[PDB]
């Protein structure tokens, strides 16, 4: 049996990924929401598929991160595949029009949060078999793609997590970890369920660390 | 007549850049220190070259950044060449080993600081002739270079600011701004603060196109 950790599973790509993993046999899923009590569809999935364990996590909240290791541990001794999917996208457009608060909130939720979350959960991941570590990033975070769009604090947060993900891939190569940053697509437009089907196949198959990948398995430049 | 603005001019490259400009014919220089009152080299520099103006700036401190345009406005109608030089470099090595505060301090000092600084001085830069914007970055900030080192919060912060620098260049291109990310070199191969300064002042004056990521010598770096 394999255990997957997905942050931000209450909706979007995250929910579709949990819904996709719940169908697979022998996949325990630790699914997080800021507010489980309100996570109607996730909770109904967990009611039907007890493979699916729901836990609270606010990745902006250090006090929430300080508890995620012990709380995930109640449901599993190990994590095979870790997915940092929870993230905000609330700041686009020009630098001069981006208030301080937006830079900060993208930093805390999109950069420090995934990093702290990986720090807290690394031990559980070390004790797993797959040792796979995915940060759901964006093609917007690329330092070398031009979309002729301003991504402001959003893109800046994804470039930052990209930089530290590539560094992490190097640090955990000797421990036989697979680390990737993955663009889940434009949800050309695709549905969250399409994204999750592609993402899930990618999680399964990827067998080399340090990749910046799109959902379809092709590579993006950092 | 040109106004240069330089953050962190009390020591390091920043002092060496201000020292060189203060010898330059018809150049006014707003130089910043966290603590003007103990920036004794720079106070003597401005005493001996009063074209040099010393104002308080803590780029980690939003209250300090909220005052910079008024502080700068005391001495000048405009900024021709803006240099975000002030910055920290306190955290390297593995992710698992980088505590929360190092990631936080490098974001606030090395990313938000320069963004808020530029937001505050853009009206004065807009009013100037040269419209030249330099963020002192690092080669460690590249997403496409491998020095066989991890740079932790430091590298992340330079990469972060690098992303926004590139965006700012796109955004201000039609306002005829020249925006550049510039690696000043590894300063005391090792080079001297005065060598860095000399090469930077040369780049500051000759740089004609925007959106570039440059080393001190004027070679391009990959984003
Ligand atoms: N959709 C797209 O086109 C693209 C998306 N992405 C990436 O895809 C991932 C998910 O996107 P998508 O499903 O569309 O996003 P949604 O906005 O649909 O949902 C985001 C998820 O993140 C959770 N989340 C947000 N803030 C926090 C927080 N502080 N603590 C914990 N959980 C939080 C949300 O919970 P809550 O309901 O509580 O807000 C939700 O579960 C992200 O990593 C994003 O960066 C990037 C490229 C393109
Ligand atoms: N120099 C190098 O070899 C390399 C460094 N860089 C870049 O070059 C820049 C210049 O380096 P250098 O001047 O020698 O740096 P130093 O290491 O000597 O010190 C940092 C400088 O920034 C100031 N400073 C630090 N923190 C703050 C703050 N919170 N608010 C305001 N000012 C602050 C310091 O003033 P104070 O005395 O008060 O601390 C000092 O002038 C760096 O800041 C960095 O971005 C990048 C690549 C290589």
XYZ file of C-alpha atoms and ligand atoms in Angstrom:
541
model
C 0.000 0.000 0.000
C 0.950 3.602 -0.861
C -0.031 6.776 1.101
C -0.473 10.107 -0.735
C -0.559 13.520 0.988
C -2.510 16.229 -0.929
C -2.855 19.826 0.463
C -5.968 21.810 -0.551
C -8.176 18.807 -1.425
C -11.581 20.475 -0.670
C -11.922 21.711 -4.309
C -10.130 22.357 -7.614
C -7.275 20.173 -8.869
C -6.690 18.923 -5.246
C -10.225 17.446 -4.861
C -10.017 15.943 -8.409
C -6.600 14.396 -7.464
C -8.012 12.943 -4.180
C -11.175 11.762 -6.114
C -8.803 10.136 -8.708
C -6.609 8.453 -5.987
C -9.715 7.281 -3.978
C -10.727 5.051 -7.014
C -7.253 3.331 -7.157
C -6.964 0.245 -4.857
C -4.321 0.268 -2.077
C -3.908 4.099 -2.058
C -4.515 5.673 1.370
C -4.972 9.485 0.830
C -4.341 12.187 3.516
C -6.446 15.110 2.149
C -6.198 18.607 3.773
C -8.624 21.556 3.917
C -8.365 24.906 5.812
C -11.952 24.265 6.938
C -12.860 20.548 6.758
C -16.344 21.145 8.373
C -17.329 23.088 5.195
C -15.585 20.627 2.756
C -18.936 19.003 1.612
C -17.732 17.000 -1.466
C -14.374 15.958 0.174
C -16.246 14.814 3.344
C -18.795 12.784 1.237
C -15.821 11.146 -0.647
C -14.269 10.251 2.769
C -17.649 8.929 4.048
C -17.800 6.493 1.030
C -14.018 5.810 0.656
C -12.399 5.411 4.104
C -8.950 5.163 2.269
C -9.466 9.019 2.314
C -8.513 10.701 5.639
C -9.334 14.443 5.998
C -7.106 16.716 8.172
C -7.113 20.543 8.704
C -4.190 22.570 7.307
C -3.767 26.330 6.847
C -0.350 26.598 5.051
C -0.386 30.423 5.762
C -0.563 29.555 9.520
C 2.650 28.471 11.336
C 0.408 27.244 14.221
C -1.430 24.978 11.691
C 1.929 23.768 10.172
C 3.375 22.969 13.694
C 0.605 20.312 14.077
C 0.369 18.733 10.559
C 3.174 16.145 11.208
C 1.644 14.716 14.451
C -1.930 14.901 12.974
C -1.006 13.165 9.656
C 0.832 10.561 11.859
C -2.525 9.561 13.511
C -3.593 8.157 10.079
C -0.232 6.848 8.692
C 3.373 5.886 9.587
C 4.636 7.092 6.155
C 3.946 9.233 3.066
C 4.929 7.728 -0.296
C 3.878 10.712 -2.445
C 3.624 14.304 -1.139
C 1.708 16.928 -3.143
C 1.835 20.635 -2.152
C -1.290 21.617 -4.163
C -2.910 24.261 -1.829
C -1.907 27.779 -3.068
C -3.519 31.191 -3.811
C -3.671 33.098 -7.133
C -4.957 36.595 -6.105
C -2.359 39.064 -7.569
C -1.712 39.780 -11.273
C -0.895 42.965 -13.183
C 1.727 45.661 -12.818
C 4.338 45.937 -10.016
C 3.394 49.619 -9.270
C -0.316 48.526 -8.787
C 0.541 45.585 -6.443
C 0.117 46.534 -2.767
C 2.534 45.277 -0.060
C -0.169 42.933 1.358
C -0.367 40.930 -1.921
C 3.455 40.308 -2.091
C 3.348 39.248 1.578
C 0.307 36.927 1.299
C 1.722 35.175 -1.841
C 5.086 34.758 -0.021
C 3.441 33.230 3.107
C 0.875 30.981 1.352
C 2.771 30.044 -1.855
C 6.498 29.979 -0.745
C 7.022 29.654 3.070
C 3.885 27.472 3.489
C 4.893 24.700 1.035
C 8.481 24.862 2.358
C 7.415 24.595 6.039
C 4.885 21.882 5.138
C 7.634 19.833 3.380
C 9.955 20.375 6.442
C 7.261 19.090 8.847
C 6.339 16.072 6.643
C 9.885 15.093 5.383
C 10.332 12.418 8.140
C 7.033 10.666 7.205
C 8.145 10.876 3.534
C 11.636 9.475 4.435
C 9.916 6.397 6.003
C 7.808 5.853 2.835
C 8.812 3.817 -0.265
C 8.071 6.128 -3.255
C 9.843 9.239 -1.651
C 8.094 11.416 -4.272
C 7.692 15.186 -3.544
C 5.556 17.362 -5.851
C 5.082 21.127 -5.633
C 2.145 22.139 -7.818
C 3.757 25.179 -9.432
C 2.741 27.119 -12.578
C 4.262 27.788 -16.019
C 3.809 31.447 -14.864
C 6.689 30.914 -12.345
C 9.149 30.147 -15.214
C 11.979 32.712 -15.428
C 12.192 31.959 -19.246
C 8.645 31.854 -20.731
C 6.846 34.968 -22.030
C 3.042 34.877 -21.770
C 2.756 38.673 -22.373
C 0.858 38.691 -19.055
C 2.002 40.218 -15.698
C 1.795 37.562 -12.874
C 2.886 39.995 -10.097
C 3.042 38.402 -6.579
C 1.478 35.145 -7.990
C 4.234 34.367 -10.536
C 6.913 35.770 -8.149
C 5.715 33.244 -5.450
C 5.855 30.359 -8.009
C 9.367 31.349 -9.273
C 10.471 31.467 -5.583
C 9.099 27.975 -4.781
C 10.580 26.757 -8.156
C 14.076 27.988 -7.070
C 13.862 26.188 -3.682
C 12.288 23.048 -5.330
C 15.258 22.700 -7.775
C 17.632 23.118 -4.733
C 15.632 20.549 -2.766
C 15.861 18.060 -5.712
C 19.697 18.413 -5.456
C 19.735 18.025 -1.628
C 17.556 14.811 -1.604
C 19.063 13.071 -4.712
C 21.402 11.101 -2.350
C 18.337 9.960 -0.261
C 16.704 8.663 -3.544
C 13.854 11.259 -3.404
C 12.010 12.333 -6.589
C 11.338 16.110 -6.395
C 9.332 17.998 -9.080
C 7.662 21.329 -9.701
C 4.523 20.615 -11.830
C 2.297 22.997 -13.774
C -1.172 21.382 -13.529
C -2.436 23.201 -16.714
C -4.809 26.091 -17.354
C -7.843 24.924 -15.332
C -5.325 26.056 -23.475
C -8.069 25.241 -20.868
C -8.498 21.810 -19.175
C -10.895 20.656 -16.425
C -9.713 19.895 -12.870
C -10.610 16.174 -13.478
C -8.461 16.121 -16.699
C -5.580 17.856 -14.825
C -5.859 15.303 -11.954
C -5.910 12.275 -14.395
C -2.723 13.637 -16.090
C -1.170 14.685 -12.718
C -1.932 11.232 -11.195
C -0.269 9.338 -14.113
C 2.763 11.747 -13.776
C 3.004 11.057 -9.974
C 2.897 7.282 -10.659
C 5.491 7.167 -13.489
C 8.018 9.963 -12.689
C 11.296 8.241 -11.772
C 13.824 11.135 -12.009
C 14.199 14.177 -9.680
C 14.765 17.909 -10.390
C 12.179 18.226 -13.206
C 9.954 21.281 -13.944
C 7.034 19.536 -15.697
C 3.642 20.284 -17.236
C 0.726 17.914 -16.402
C 1.295 16.070 -19.774
C 4.832 14.979 -18.622
C 6.687 17.481 -20.939
C 9.379 19.745 -19.395
C 9.218 23.530 -18.793
C 12.343 25.693 -18.581
C 12.945 27.066 -15.011
C 23.414 67.297 -14.018
C 22.244 63.776 -12.844
C 20.816 62.479 -9.525
C 21.885 58.918 -8.549
C 20.052 57.194 -5.582
C 21.964 54.313 -3.825
C 20.577 52.144 -0.903
C 23.177 50.740 1.600
C 26.043 53.259 0.911
C 27.664 53.229 4.451
C 29.896 50.193 3.599
C 30.577 47.596 0.826
C 29.939 48.052 -2.966
C 27.385 50.818 -2.091
C 30.031 53.000 -0.368
C 32.550 52.341 -3.236
C 29.853 53.335 -5.842
C 29.039 56.596 -3.902
C 32.859 57.334 -3.507
C 33.297 57.086 -7.340
C 30.147 59.192 -8.180
C 31.279 61.933 -5.647
C 34.469 62.386 -7.783
C 32.196 62.584 -10.930
C 31.509 66.070 -12.452
C 27.965 67.426 -11.812
C 26.502 64.354 -9.968
C 24.124 64.574 -6.949
C 23.959 61.354 -4.839
C 21.247 60.343 -2.332
C 23.043 57.594 -0.297
C 21.102 55.645 2.387
C 22.201 53.955 5.633
C 20.037 52.106 8.198
C 21.757 54.424 10.738
C 23.174 57.638 9.185
C 24.601 58.538 12.673
C 27.186 55.651 12.612
C 27.854 55.650 8.806
C 31.042 57.633 9.643
C 32.926 56.890 6.339
C 29.809 58.064 4.428
C 29.202 61.158 6.681
C 32.910 62.211 6.115
C 32.352 61.353 2.388
C 29.332 63.811 2.281
C 31.171 66.397 4.503
C 34.069 66.332 1.920
C 31.597 66.042 -1.048
C 28.286 67.750 -0.040
C 26.757 66.827 -3.481
C 26.443 63.483 -1.556
C 23.238 63.454 0.592
C 22.903 60.864 3.458
C 19.274 59.852 4.328
C 17.905 57.057 6.604
C 16.607 53.851 4.899
C 15.888 50.416 6.410
C 14.499 48.396 3.399
C 13.347 45.715 5.976
C 11.250 48.401 7.720
C 7.998 49.489 5.975
C 7.840 52.647 8.266
C 11.361 53.574 6.944
C 10.305 52.959 3.265
C 7.069 55.023 3.875
C 9.398 58.063 4.483
C 11.975 57.569 1.653
C 10.285 59.753 -1.097
C 9.937 62.711 1.416
C 13.529 62.014 2.685
C 14.838 61.911 -0.955
C 12.559 64.895 -1.964
C 14.426 67.167 0.577
C 17.422 67.180 -1.893
C 16.082 66.560 -5.466
C 13.127 67.002 -7.897
C 14.195 63.659 -9.565
C 16.254 60.413 -9.659
C 18.140 59.727 -12.959
C 19.696 56.395 -11.858
C 18.101 54.331 -9.038
C 20.180 51.541 -7.465
C 18.596 48.998 -5.072
C 21.917 47.821 -3.547
C 21.041 47.402 0.173
C 20.269 43.691 0.834
C 21.211 40.798 3.159
C 22.871 37.412 2.484
C 22.572 35.498 5.794
C 21.123 32.049 4.829
C 22.632 29.341 2.542
C 22.587 25.530 2.369
C 19.762 22.952 2.494
C 15.986 23.714 2.592
C 15.345 21.337 5.590
C 18.061 23.315 7.539
C 16.652 26.813 6.642
C 14.401 28.011 9.517
C 11.194 30.060 8.963
C 12.762 33.446 9.981
C 15.584 33.179 7.368
C 12.991 32.660 4.567
C 10.883 35.506 6.058
C 13.799 37.994 6.608
C 15.217 37.357 3.078
C 11.748 37.946 1.526
C 11.087 41.243 3.451
C 14.647 42.653 3.104
C 15.594 41.271 -0.336
C 12.244 41.209 -2.272
C 9.488 43.425 -0.703
C 12.029 46.089 0.407
C 13.289 46.761 -3.181
C 9.726 46.553 -4.651
C 8.330 49.029 -2.044
C 11.473 51.245 -2.444
C 10.979 51.464 -6.257
C 7.181 52.017 -5.769
C 8.027 55.069 -3.511
C 10.758 56.587 -5.779
C 9.093 55.869 -9.166
C 7.424 59.339 -9.266
C 10.914 60.974 -8.775
C 12.525 58.468 -11.283
C 9.634 59.211 -13.763
C 10.514 62.989 -13.467
C 14.275 62.298 -14.186
C 16.039 62.146 -17.624
C 17.844 58.735 -17.487
C 14.940 56.592 -16.086
C 17.553 53.881 -15.212
C 16.610 51.204 -12.643
C 19.236 48.806 -11.225
C 18.466 46.016 -8.754
C 21.744 44.598 -7.431
C 20.954 40.860 -7.777
C 23.305 37.827 -7.528
C 24.277 35.123 -10.035
C 23.001 32.769 -7.240
C 19.527 34.153 -8.158
C 19.573 32.481 -11.658
C 17.168 29.533 -12.124
C 19.622 28.200 -14.826
C 23.100 28.269 -13.186
C 24.629 25.607 -10.878
C 27.612 26.755 -8.733
C 27.583 23.419 -6.815
C 26.142 25.412 -3.849
C 22.672 25.818 -2.267
C 21.701 29.482 -1.579
C 18.532 28.830 0.538
C 16.579 32.073 1.395
C 19.328 34.302 -0.179
C 19.118 32.644 -3.634
C 15.297 32.342 -3.463
C 15.033 36.154 -2.629
C 17.321 37.208 -5.544
C 15.350 34.848 -7.900
C 12.057 36.291 -6.515
C 13.224 39.919 -7.101
C 14.675 38.754 -10.502
C 11.179 37.559 -11.560
C 9.611 40.983 -10.651
C 12.579 42.946 -12.079
C 11.934 41.208 -15.476
C 8.179 42.012 -15.184
C 8.945 45.709 -14.210
C 11.201 45.983 -17.354
C 8.293 44.694 -19.589
C 5.829 47.066 -17.771
C 7.983 50.287 -17.945
C 9.552 49.665 -21.447
C 7.026 52.030 -23.133
C 7.801 54.707 -20.442
C 11.442 54.471 -21.737
C 12.784 52.980 -18.444
C 15.969 50.877 -18.468
C 15.473 48.162 -15.814
C 18.332 45.726 -15.051
C 19.191 42.895 -12.630
C 23.016 43.253 -12.067
C 25.354 40.742 -10.338
C 28.102 42.977 -8.839
C 30.598 40.045 -8.694
C 31.900 38.231 -5.571
C 33.424 41.185 -3.632
C 35.969 41.421 -0.707
C 37.045 34.801 -8.450
C 37.137 37.326 -5.537
C 37.139 41.080 -6.533
C 37.523 44.378 -4.518
C 34.563 46.639 -3.570
C 36.223 49.421 -5.689
C 36.587 47.030 -8.747
C 32.833 46.132 -8.389
C 31.941 49.884 -8.116
C 34.146 50.810 -11.147
C 32.522 48.072 -13.334
C 28.990 48.971 -12.003
C 29.266 52.766 -12.630
C 30.395 51.860 -16.230
C 27.344 49.521 -16.714
C 25.014 52.180 -15.125
C 26.163 54.801 -17.681
C 26.429 52.652 -20.880
C 23.353 50.371 -20.386
C 20.995 51.458 -23.230
C 18.396 48.494 -23.338
C 15.938 47.257 -20.615
C 15.023 43.746 -19.323
C 18.675 42.547 -19.002
C 20.203 40.307 -16.298
C 23.891 41.348 -16.251
C 27.145 40.559 -14.456
C 29.433 43.524 -13.436
C 31.536 43.056 -16.697
C 28.341 43.563 -18.785
C 27.964 39.924 -19.940
C 24.368 38.563 -19.875
C 23.272 35.995 -17.254
C 20.400 33.541 -17.897
C 17.242 34.224 -15.855
N -6.030 26.695 -12.051
C -5.043 27.012 -12.884
O -5.259 27.378 -14.054
C -3.638 26.947 -12.371
C -3.415 26.571 -11.043
N -2.144 26.473 -10.516
C -1.862 25.763 -9.221
O -2.816 24.751 -9.000
C -2.941 24.498 -7.579
C -4.403 24.448 -7.231
O -5.119 25.259 -8.190
P -6.725 25.197 -8.246
O -7.203 23.832 -7.828
O -7.173 25.770 -9.556
O -7.013 26.273 -7.088
P -8.348 26.733 -6.354
O -8.269 28.216 -6.149
O -9.494 26.147 -7.115
O -8.174 25.988 -4.940
C -6.947 26.197 -4.189
C -6.867 25.214 -3.038
O -5.838 25.684 -2.119
C -6.409 25.777 -0.843
N -5.762 26.808 -0.064
C -5.704 28.145 -0.356
N -5.135 28.856 0.584
C -4.849 27.938 1.581
C -4.247 28.079 2.844
N -3.867 29.248 3.367
N -4.095 26.947 3.570
C -4.504 25.777 3.052
N -5.108 25.535 1.891
C -5.244 26.670 1.193
C -7.877 26.096 -1.106
O -8.663 25.925 0.079
P -9.826 27.037 0.313
O -11.038 26.426 -0.303
O -9.853 27.035 1.821
O -9.480 28.388 -0.313
C -8.138 25.057 -2.177
O -8.296 23.789 -1.543
C -2.136 25.595 -6.874
O -0.911 25.054 -6.386
C -1.983 26.640 -7.975
O -0.847 27.466 -7.781
C -1.097 27.036 -11.218
C -1.153 27.183 -12.533
C -2.449 27.307 -13.227
N 28.923 41.751 -2.784
C 28.911 40.546 -3.338
O 29.933 39.873 -3.491
C 27.608 40.009 -3.768
C 26.502 40.556 -3.196
N 25.385 40.744 -3.956
C 24.571 41.996 -3.845
O 25.447 43.098 -3.670
C 24.895 43.979 -2.663
C 25.960 44.905 -2.119
O 26.829 44.198 -1.192
P 27.573 44.999 -0.006
O 27.187 46.448 -0.057
O 29.031 44.689 -0.045
O 26.928 44.280 1.295
P 27.346 43.914 2.814
O 27.367 42.427 2.959
O 28.600 44.653 3.160
O 26.123 44.515 3.686
C 24.788 44.780 3.139
C 24.612 46.250 2.804
O 23.195 46.584 2.801
C 22.886 47.347 3.951
N 21.712 46.769 4.583
C 21.594 45.499 5.077
N 20.415 45.249 5.590
C 19.708 46.426 5.415
C 18.389 46.799 5.747
N 17.512 45.993 6.345
N 18.005 48.058 5.422
C 18.886 48.865 4.813
N 20.148 48.625 4.471
C 20.502 47.373 4.796
C 24.120 47.319 4.848
O 24.102 48.454 5.735
P 24.360 48.150 7.331
O 25.800 48.557 7.456
O 23.464 49.028 8.167
O 24.154 46.663 7.634
C 25.204 47.284 3.775
O 25.369 48.508 3.071
C 24.240 43.004 -1.676
O 23.352 43.697 -0.808
C 23.609 41.981 -2.650
O 22.294 42.282 -3.110
C 25.075 39.756 -4.873
C 26.018 38.980 -5.385
C 27.380 38.945 -4.806
